[PDB]
Design an enzyme around this catalytic site. Structure first.
Site, PDB file in Angstrom:
ATOM      1  CB  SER A 395      -0.902  -0.004   1.240  1.00 53.57           C
ATOM      2  OG  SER A 395      -1.650  -1.213   1.339  1.00 53.57           O
ATOM      3  CB  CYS A 564      -5.065  -0.143   6.141  1.00 56.20           C
ATOM      4  SG  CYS A 564      -3.686  -0.781   5.197  1.00 56.20           S
ATOM      5  CG  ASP A 609      -5.050  -1.345   1.608  1.00 59.09           C
ATOM      6  OD1 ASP A 609      -4.822  -2.480   1.150  1.00 59.09           O
ATOM      7  OD2 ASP A 609      -4.231  -0.408   1.509  1.00 59.09           O
ATOM      8  CD1 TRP A 611      -1.284  -8.061   4.424  1.00 60.61           C
ATOM      9  CD2 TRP A 611      -2.079  -6.023   3.933  1.00 60.61           C
ATOM     10  NE1 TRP A 611      -0.514  -7.136   5.094  1.00 60.61           N
ATOM     11  CE2 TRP A 611      -0.979  -5.879   4.813  1.00 60.61           C
ATOM     12  CE3 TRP A 611      -2.740  -4.870   3.484  1.00 60.61           C
ATOM     13  CZ2 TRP A 611      -0.525  -4.628   5.256  1.00 60.61           C
ATOM     14  CZ3 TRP A 611      -2.285  -3.625   3.924  1.00 60.61           C
ATOM     15  CH2 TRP A 611      -1.186  -3.516   4.803  1.00 60.61           C
TER      16      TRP A 611
HETATM   17  C1  LIG Z   1      -3.321  -5.559  -1.492  1.00 59.31           C
HETATM   18  C2  LIG Z   1      -2.343  -5.882  -0.557  1.00 59.31           C
HETATM   19  C3  LIG Z   1      -1.692  -4.868   0.137  1.00 59.31           C
HETATM   20  C4  LIG Z   1      -0.598  -5.163   0.944  1.00 59.31           C
HETATM   21  N1  LIG Z   1       0.055  -4.174   1.573  1.00 59.31           N
HETATM   22  C5  LIG Z   1       1.145  -4.453   2.301  1.00 59.31           C
HETATM   23  C6  LIG Z   1       1.835  -3.432   2.944  1.00 59.31           C
HETATM   24  O1  LIG Z   1       1.650  -2.258   2.626  1.00 59.31           O
HETATM   25  N2  LIG Z   1       2.853  -3.744   3.854  1.00 59.31           N
HETATM   26  C7  LIG Z   1       3.188  -5.080   4.102  1.00 59.31           C
HETATM   27  O2  LIG Z   1       4.037  -5.364   4.946  1.00 59.31           O
HETATM   28  N3  LIG Z   1       2.510  -6.102   3.429  1.00 59.31           N
HETATM   29  C8  LIG Z   1       1.480  -5.783   2.538  1.00 59.31           C
HETATM   30  N4  LIG Z   1       0.957  -6.743   1.764  1.00 59.31           N
HETATM   31  C9  LIG Z   1       1.501  -8.118   1.865  1.00 59.31           C
HETATM   32  C10 LIG Z   1       2.568  -8.303   0.781  1.00 59.31           C
HETATM   33  O3  LIG Z   1       1.954  -8.245  -0.507  1.00 59.31           O
HETATM   34  C11 LIG Z   1       3.341  -9.618   0.918  1.00 59.31           C
HETATM   35  O4  LIG Z   1       2.438 -10.724   0.997  1.00 59.31           O
HETATM   36  C12 LIG Z   1       4.247  -9.582   2.151  1.00 59.31           C
HETATM   37  O5  LIG Z   1       5.114  -8.447   2.076  1.00 59.31           O
HETATM   38  C13 LIG Z   1       5.076 -10.867   2.222  1.00 59.31           C
HETATM   39  O6  LIG Z   1       5.717 -11.083   0.961  1.00 59.31           O
HETATM   40  P1  LIG Z   1       7.130 -11.846   0.853  1.00 59.31           P
HETATM   41  O7  LIG Z   1       7.387 -12.102  -0.582  1.00 59.31           O
HETATM   42  O8  LIG Z   1       8.141 -11.099   1.635  1.00 59.31           O
HETATM   43  O9  LIG Z   1       6.863 -13.240   1.612  1.00 59.31           O
HETATM   44  P2  LIG Z   1       6.358 -14.548   0.822  1.00 59.31           P
HETATM   45  O10 LIG Z   1       7.540 -15.280   0.315  1.00 59.31           O
HETATM   46  O11 LIG Z   1       5.307 -14.128  -0.132  1.00 59.31           O
HETATM   47  O12 LIG Z   1       5.690 -15.408   2.007  1.00 59.31           O
HETATM   48  C14 LIG Z   1       4.402 -15.070   2.527  1.00 59.31           C
HETATM   49  C15 LIG Z   1       3.802 -16.314   3.187  1.00 59.31           C
HETATM   50  O13 LIG Z   1       4.659 -16.809   4.225  1.00 59.31           O
HETATM   51  C16 LIG Z   1       3.825 -17.570   5.116  1.00 59.31           C
HETATM   52  N5  LIG Z   1       4.122 -17.074   6.477  1.00 59.31           N
HETATM   53  C17 LIG Z   1       4.438 -15.683   6.857  1.00 59.31           C
HETATM   54  N6  LIG Z   1       4.684 -15.845   8.305  1.00 59.31           N
HETATM   55  C18 LIG Z   1       4.502 -17.124   8.631  1.00 59.31           C
HETATM   56  C19 LIG Z   1       4.623 -17.713   9.819  1.00 59.31           C
HETATM   57  N7  LIG Z   1       4.962 -16.923  10.835  1.00 59.31           N
HETATM   58  N8  LIG Z   1       4.332 -19.006  10.014  1.00 59.31           N
HETATM   59  C20 LIG Z   1       3.866 -19.762   8.933  1.00 59.31           C
HETATM   60  N9  LIG Z   1       3.731 -19.111   7.703  1.00 59.31           N
HETATM   61  C21 LIG Z   1       4.060 -17.816   7.580  1.00 59.31           C
HETATM   62  C22 LIG Z   1       2.387 -17.280   4.713  1.00 59.31           C
HETATM   63  O14 LIG Z   1       1.897 -18.327   3.863  1.00 59.31           O
HETATM   64  C23 LIG Z   1       2.524 -15.984   3.935  1.00 59.31           C
HETATM   65  O15 LIG Z   1       1.446 -15.879   2.995  1.00 59.31           O
HETATM   66  C24 LIG Z   1      -0.138  -6.474   1.039  1.00 59.31           C
HETATM   67  C25 LIG Z   1      -0.817  -7.493   0.380  1.00 59.31           C
HETATM   68  C26 LIG Z   1      -1.918  -7.200  -0.418  1.00 59.31           C
HETATM   69  C27 LIG Z   1      -2.560  -8.224  -1.106  1.00 59.31           C
END
Ligand SMILES: Cc1cc2nc3c(=O)[nH]c(=O)nc-3n(C[C@H](O)[C@H](O)[C@H](O)COP(=O)(O)OP(=O)(O)OC[C@H]3O[C@@H](n4cnc5c(N)ncnc54)[C@H](O)[C@@H]3O)c2cc1C
Ligand SMILES: Cc1cc2nc3c(=O)[nH]c(=O)nc-3n(C[C@H](O)[C@H](O)[C@H](O)COP(=O)(O)O)c2cc1C
Ligand SMILES: Nc1ncnc2c1ncn2[C@@H]1O[C@H](CO)[C@@H](O)[C@H]1OP(=O)(O)O
Length: 612
Positions: A395, A564, A609, A611
């Site tokens: 966001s 949010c 907003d 997630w």
């Molecule tokens: C519309 C929207 C807005 C968003 N806005 C933001 C934002 O502004 N700021 C923000 O920080 N994020 C936000 N996100 C989330 C962001 O898009 C990512 O999903 C997040 O940053 C993690 O991505 P990554 O690639 O670092 O981790 P990834 O490699 O994508 O891993 C994420 C997955 O790890 C697993 N996981 C995480 N913690 C654990 C745990 N403790 N134990 C077991 N499983 C776990 C879950 O399955 C999680 O879905 C938003 C998501 C959406 C959809």
């Protein structure tokens, strides 16, 4: 708004020419439905039929009326829902469904909806399509599938799919008929460097030679000008990044999201190659064995396996069952081949093992390759089986009124101990955390317009609720409301309900918020420090505390509410608190308070907003 693509010629005529009798369309935004459609299209072959997947956006669904021209024809729709609407690629189909009067007599269909029960309109798109096709005259061949990503979508698909095919075979009088490759490998020796992809998403060298407009297929490589830690402790790492979008011609408003294309952990990639005993630096192409399909490759080719594993493939999420099922043949230890084989089970120990050993334990492909050491698939086939690496959304934490050439991001780095025994790292956040300002640190990105927006009238009151990283879009809102005041505009009350554990540990943007408060940009800065006392103090408790005034803003001031952050529990708890506020001050019974709040949502006065 979005310019429409030039449609392919009728999909029915293409099915006739290619001997296909079943077509599966996908409404997808994160590729899940696309994978599901591809799996179903592939299943057809095992039942004496022949199918093809297809993006509804590239076709005129009006040709469905011509589908009966093909004997024992069938169309399946795997559709995900987003914000209660169709996915971007299915908006065209949706609009046609609503306006058309075409008769679909003779058409046989089935629908598998991809959704998540935690959202207001669960599987809204799948439900609509299933009902609308019948209203138009088509006949349902199998029940509507309701996939719930809040439980386990993969299992909902397995269960539906296992019942779907027997139903199809029984109705059309067909019967169930070995591993099959979708692509063939073509290694390239002596190949020029200029023709090898190195991580770009669209046209070759599109990352080096940047040409607007920039979007999902042509992301703008934004320079990271700032990347700093926002919290004090060492428990977590919360960060604030600023991406330079100068000269990109990209426009954005507070409330929009910024998407980024990350790179996987190089050590992870390296280890996959090492354990497979494969040369990751081999240049190659995976070419569709079906020369008719427009999908010539699984990802940009030619390229090295190392590049594919780093920029184009998902190598961290738990593998889906079909992948493990296809990999089983490469496990020389019988017991390991058996476990992998049974992961696709719709019940029993096979299913239980998949749910606990793969999903709950969060085992990624490398972990499985390590824990089932006899599993040694050829690298090219594994690359054909792995899902595409998706962009991540954030966001935007800045106002284009104040920072037109910079897009800010507020995120928490993902890093946790998994039951699989290893520390799992978030792909995008680990990558972002490592980006150091000044060589240039570049982030491939693009902007996605949202409907989360500040009120058109400066005078309309704003109620912002965003604990933790949920504060992100609000830093943008506040910057903008401040700016409006500085420009002589009359601004209504601007209230922030934020929350963190402790003031001196994870109070994000503490200094900036204090200033806005001091200057009057923020009428109220209500912060719930959840861990400074024995009881949990959350934003909803503050909303309940300020119930009388909030009702005034809502009932008399036409205030807009914004939420949010965590959609799992916080968003619901906050919603329930607003229900209670309305019920007491209306006054009115709970049931009516709920309708009132859900009505604010439709009237554009309660935006989300959230997630997971
Ligand atoms: C519309 C929207 C807005 C968003 N806005 C933001 C934002 O502004 N700021 C923000 O920080 N994020 C936000 N996100 C989330 C962001 O898009 C990512 O999903 C997040 O940053 C993690 O991505 P990554 O690639 O670092 O981790 P990834 O490699 O994508 O891993 C994420 C997955 O790890 C697993 N996981 C995480 N913690 C654990 C745990 N403790 N134990 C077991 N499983 C776990 C879950 O399955 C999680 O879905 C938003 C998501 C959406 C959809
Ligand atoms: C920002 C966002 C909004 C969503 N909104 C809804 C929704 O309104 N209703 C629903 O049933 N599912 C909703 N979902 C869940 C998706 O429909 C579900 O995760 C689906 O599996 C995604 O499929 P895809 O990868 O094919 O796009 C949402 C997911 C995200 C990330
Ligand atoms: N259900 C909920 N409703 C509102 N805030 C919540 C919440 N669950 C956790 N929080 C709080 O959201 C903030 C950001 O994560 C933290 O203060 C966290 O407090 P906790 O972690 O002490 O429970």
């Amino acid at each position: 708004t979005t310019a429409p693509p030039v449609k392919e010629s009728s999909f029915v005529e293409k099915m006739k020419k290619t001997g296909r009798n079943i077509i599966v369309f996908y409404g997808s935004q994160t590729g899940t439905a696309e994978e599901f459609a591809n799996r179903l299209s592939k299943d057809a072959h095992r039942y004496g039929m022949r199918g093809m997947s297809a993006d509804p956006e590239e076709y005129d669904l009006a040709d469905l009326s011509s589908l009966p021209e093909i004997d024992k024809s069938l169309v399946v729709f795997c559709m995900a829902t987003y914000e209660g609407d169709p996915t971007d690629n299915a908006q065209d189909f949706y609009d046609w469904l609503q306006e058309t009067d075409v008769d679909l007599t003779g058409v046989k269909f089935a629908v598998f909806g991809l959704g998540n029960k935690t959202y207001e309109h669960f599987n809204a798109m799948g439900k609509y399509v299933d009902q609308r096709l019948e209203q138009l005259g088509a006949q349902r061949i199998f029940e509507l599938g309701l996939g719930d990503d809040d439980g386990n979508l993969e299992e909902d698909f397995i269960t539906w799919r296992e019942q779907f095919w027997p139903a199809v075979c029984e109705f059309f009088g067909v019967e169930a008929t070995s591993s099959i490759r979708q692509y063939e490998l073509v290694v390239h020796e002596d190949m020029d460097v200029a023709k090898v992809y190195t991580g770009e998403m669209g046209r070759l060298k599109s990352y080096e030679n940047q040409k607007p407009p920039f979007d999902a297929k042509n992301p703008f490589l934004a320079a990271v000008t700032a990347n700093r830690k926002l919290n004090q402790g060492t428990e977590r790492h919360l960060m604030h990044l600023e991406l330079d979008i100068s000269d990109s011609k990209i426009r954005y408003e507070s409330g929009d999201h910024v998407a980024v294309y990350p790179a996987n952990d190089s050590a992870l990639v390296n280890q996959i190659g090492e354990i497979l005993g494969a040369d990751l630096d081999v240049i190659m192409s995976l070419n569709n064995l079906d020369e008719e399909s427009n999908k010539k490759h699984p990802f940009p080719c030619p390229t090295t396996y190392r590049t594919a594993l780093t920029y184009y493939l998902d190598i961290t999420n738990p593998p889906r069952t079909n992948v493990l099922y296809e990999l089983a043949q490469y496990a020389s230890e019988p017991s390991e081949q058996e476990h992998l084989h049974k992961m696709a089970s719709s019940s029993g120990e096979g299913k239980e093992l998949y749910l606990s050993w793969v999903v709950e334990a969060r085992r990624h492909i490398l972990a499985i390759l390590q824990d089932y050491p006899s599993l040694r698939p050829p690298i090219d086939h594994l690359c054909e089986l792995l899902p595409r690496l998706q962009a991540r959304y954030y966001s935007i934490a800045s106002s284009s009124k104040v920072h037109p050439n910079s897009v800010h991001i507020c995120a928490v780095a993902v890093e946790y101990e998994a039951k699989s025994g290893r520390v799992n790292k978030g792909v995008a956040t680990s990558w972002l955390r490592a980006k150091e300002p000044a060589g240039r640190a570049l982030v491939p990105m693009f902007v996605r317009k949202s409907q989360f927006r500040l009120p058109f009238k400066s005078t309309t009151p704003v109620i912002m609720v965003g604990p933790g990283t949920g504060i992100a879009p609000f830093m943008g809102f506040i910057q903008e409301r401040a700016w409006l005041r500085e420009q002589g505009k009359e601004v209504g009350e601007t209230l922030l309900y934020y929350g963190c554990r402790r003031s001196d540990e994870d109070y994000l943007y503490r200094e900036e918020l204090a200033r806005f408060h001091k200057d009057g940009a923020l009428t109220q800065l209500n912060v719930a420090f959840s861990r400074e006392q024995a009881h949990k103090v959350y934003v909803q408790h503050l909303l309940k505390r300020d119930r009388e005034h909030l009702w005034k803003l809502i009932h008399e001031g036409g205030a807009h509410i914004y939420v949010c952050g965590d959609a799992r529990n916080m968003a619901k708890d906050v919603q329930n608190t607003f229900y209670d506020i309305v019920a007491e001050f209306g006054p009115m019974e709970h049931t009516q308070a709920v309708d009132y709040v859900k009505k604010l949502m439709t009237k554009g006065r309660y935006s989300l907003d959230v997630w997971s």
